[PDB]
Paper text:
The structure of the R32 crystal form was solved by molecular replacement, using the hexagonal setting H32. Four trimers (i.e., twelve identical protein chains) were found in the asymmetric unit. For final refinement at 3.0 Å resolution, secondary structure restraints were used as without them the model tended to get distorted.
The proximal half-fiber is formed by a parallel homo-trimer of gp34. The protein is a highly intertwined trimer containing a 2 nm-wide triple β-helix domain interspersed with three wider domains in which each of the monomers forms an anti-parallel β-sheet. The long tail fibers recognize the outer membrane protein C (OmpC) or the lipopolysaccharide (LPS) of E. coli and are responsible for the initial and reversible attachment of the virion. The carboxy-terminal parts of gp34 that we crystallized occupy the part of the proximal tail fiber closest to gp35 (the “knee”).
Residue numbers in the entry:
A (entry chain B), C (entry chain A): 894 to 1288
B (entry chain C): 890 to 1287
The structure:
């Protein structure tokens, strides 16, 4: 009776020490602890039971040598829903980490949602998120960035292209949208004084501030044009300007400086003028001399092949030369230019021979008729219509 | 109690057929090997390694939730290592899966699929501090960045509305609708919305032709290299009005076409005025003619034409500012070689005709002249005077 | 002797085999291993002890059947800070994975910082990062991308909008910023030959290379305008052009082709000219005939309602027709156009009656005075004013 029996159930009240292998073929059921100085193994399932305190696995750090960690680590499954206090939303938490702080944890809250928190930098190879993305800090991309949706910036300086010494960028300052440039070597900085293009956010009016060059034509459909402070409409100078029929490309307003002898010999020149004086009145008048070829400005007006005309103004290249203007008109139905005619002005007056008038002095004519009187020197000759009589008076 | 084989022997191997209950500390110094289970009501510890063996069913660790109190979880959790490559069915790509989670659904899992690649799936929101990915990135949902976004490569949008800058009440954005690329604006307070009626700038995607639809202002000059210009429906080329316009030599900046309204006496007193006309009538023919009076100073338009310092001329047109005033035109030409403007000359027209003294013609009436020669006949009243060239005689007829 | 006692401490030197349930109610303390062929369970805590070598848990793969994994997996807690060698920065590492490679690990380095490394693709639903973002490879977004800060590209081709057959993009090639277009069907490719708009990064000067259209008006504040090689300023043609007072919208330079009888019958026409000949000199002169209505160009100059004038030029639509120019001036204070006056030119010379001069032949006048001599045929008549005499001479 004070020995243990091998055939029936017994209760051992002494402390046993087993020096040989122990073999079990039925459940081991303990109400206390289990320390093993060697490794341990179980089949299929290991369960950590909970009787009021959260369950955990602890990985000891061991001695500070070899491949051992600096701190012990643990896996703990816990919560605060039943904790009674400010926060009770962390329903189920699977937490990993060490003596200092957690490394990471996954959790399901009361609302049923799952979060996987990392207390540092996550370092994946690839990322593939099926839902949203939020990043509070600066983002950097090593290659292209493609979106099926819209790119949106809430920064004034919104979109920037950097290359070489210069940064170009789009800036919305709520009043206007600017296309701006940086100083050389300040690619990430602010804008310089240049204002290449801007758009008024309210009116849509565009302003270009550093000059504009256009190729292949400009058309203003409405509102007209205002220019400060000059317009150079420079026509196409060809050798055949005198006889060149207009085309749809050459109609319109323009000017050409014809300064080459080969061409302006074909155009009208100016006239040498001689100043003469009336012996009687002392009033001067100009008399036309020889035609002299001269360079000049050819100017065209009119917008269609029906409506087109030209002015030819000569300019002096010699100290004694004078300026004379000429005009012509395009004749579509005749398919030719009208002949140049001289413009009459104070420097190129019409001549008595040009209009069919009698010269003021030294004149010769076929016949003349006088009604009231004819004075010769001091002798007046007066007809008397009532009778058939003439009177010779003198003073 | 009788045979000595009904007690356990202490020196040799024994087989116990009774259930032992050990109430004191038990000490082992050799392997414990069971073919059955192990329940401990207290904690457990082992050295170096814990192994969960597999004999046909996947292995797991279970963390029980316990009573709903203190720091306990609402649900039990488990770590399970499993797969489906040998499962026999639709999917056999999940070779090795390390899964953590609870009664409801998994929290996360890492897996190596059959092609050998590793994936780490999170059934919710991953919440790191920093992110550093050595490879690709894909996001199916909306993305938001709290500060700048910098790329060594190209930003590419496949949206019609592709790039938007929002500030204050306005959103500006670039829109490619496949036919044209637009720079557009939103209504005030609709920064993320669609475009209004405004069309600031657009580009034809096929021709590259640009259309500006809300007006254009330019500074520091414009040049059209080709194609010319067409304007609807007027052009105001506004010249620089200075005090010395009368004697001002042209410069490379002032050559070209323009007009100036010279409306200040201080300046137009220097310019030609208009002439007063008096309408007189020939007693004989009854036909009227205009005779020039006094010159009267007047404001006017000065217009320049010509594009170079060689080729340049001006017209001066006066306009009336008094009820009886008249309009007269004048012309001049730039003389480079002489370095001066030619003097203004009067333009002759129906309202400002040339005078007989201007052209050297005899007045139609009350005229006085040096000498005259008549060839055929001279009539005075009713008396004709006719030369006979063959003889030396004149005859007097009635 | 040599049976086990059940009331006092005993040492068992034989290998016991327990075929029935074993019940413990006090600590089990082993210096060796523990294999269980069934499941295992403990309360509250399981601890893996470390005596010089890193601790781990192993999940066996089992037979290749059912839901078993292809490879065994393990959790290992280790480090290299005390390893003595090239790298000692991995202080505490919690690593999970298999024989081929690690699946993932979290680590605290010697600097105290935490990293969570994933040896593959991380696949979350949502992402919410409180700090920075870096991606070395290509990135793709399925919807919109919004930044509170600036978007910056360091690529030449910086920003691209793709739709339909065409890709539009902004390109900074360090010298100039271009707005470029792709060939049809090459949306991700390079630019074609088109050059819609460019901006010089140094000067800000804009160049448009494929033509320009403007609506609602253009204003050049400075620098003027230069055009190659013509300007068509097309005025607004209305039915009341003859009497139409200018408005602020119609002042300025333009031309109109008035080709409809309903309108040009109101304007001056041209004059038929007849060629006459001086009986004495044989020199021809032109005499004015009938006025014939004709289409023409109406051209306006001047920029204000004070400063404004027009020229009216007629063009021939019939073989015998001639061209005549006319002029008028806007009289603001009188609120009317001055009446059209004829321009005198070689083709439309003034008539003797227009200027008050005596015709060169067959003339009639009121009175005449001669000072020097009067010749009639062969008879000279010479006054001698001093002594009061007349002389009758012959040639």
């Amino acid at each position: 009776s004070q020995f243990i029996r091998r055939d029936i159930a017994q209760t051992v009240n002494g402390s046993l020490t087993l020096t040989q292998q122990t073999n079990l073929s039925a459940p081991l059921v303990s109400s206390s602890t289990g320390e093993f100085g060697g490794s341990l193994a179980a089949n299929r399932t290991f369960t950590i039971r909970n009787t009021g305190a959260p369950t955990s696995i602890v990985f000891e750090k061991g001695p500070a040598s070899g491949a051992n960690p600096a701190q012990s680590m643990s896996i703990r499954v816990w919560g605060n829903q039943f904790g009674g206090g400010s926060d009770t939303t962390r329903s189920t938490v699977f937490e990993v980490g060490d003596d200092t702080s957690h490394h990471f944890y996954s959790q399901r809250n009361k609302d049923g949602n799952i979060a996987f928190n990392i207390n540092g930098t996550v370092m994946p190879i690839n990322i593939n998120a099926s839902g949203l993305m939020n990043v509070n800090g600066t983002a950097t991309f090593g290659r292209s960035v493609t979106a099926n949706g819209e790119f949106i910036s809430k920064s004034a300086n919104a979109f920037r292209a950097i290359n070489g010494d210069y940064g170009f960028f789009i800036r919305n300052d709520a009043s206007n949208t600017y296309f701006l440039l940086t100083a050389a070597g300040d690619q990430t900085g602010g804008f310089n004084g240049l204002r290449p293009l801007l758009i008024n956010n309210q009116s849509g009016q565009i302003t270009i501030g550093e000059g504009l060059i256009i190729a292949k034509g400009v058309t203003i459909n409405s509102g007209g044009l205002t220019v400060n402070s000059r317009i150079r409409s420079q026509g196409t100078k060809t050798s055949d300007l005198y006889t060149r029929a207009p085309t749809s490309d050459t109609v319109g307003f323009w000017s050409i400086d014809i300064n080459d002898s080969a061409t302006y010999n074909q155009f009208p020149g100016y006239f040498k003028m001689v100043e003469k004086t009336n012996e009687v009145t002392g009033l001067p008048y100009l008399e036309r001399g020889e035609e002299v070829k001269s360079p000049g400005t050819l100017t065209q007006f009119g917008n269609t092949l029906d409506s087109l005309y030209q002015d030819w103004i000569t300019y002096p290249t010699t100290p004694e030369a004078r300026t004379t203007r000429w005009t012509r008109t395009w004749q579509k139905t005749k398919n030719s230019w009208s002949s140049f005619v001289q413009v009459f002005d104070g420097g190129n007056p019409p001549q008595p021979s040009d209009i069919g008038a009698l010269p003021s002095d030294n004149a010769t004519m076929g016949n003349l008729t006088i009604r009231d009187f004819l004075r010769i020197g001091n002798v007046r000759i007066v007809p008397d219509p009532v009778n058939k009589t003439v009177k010779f008076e003198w003073v």
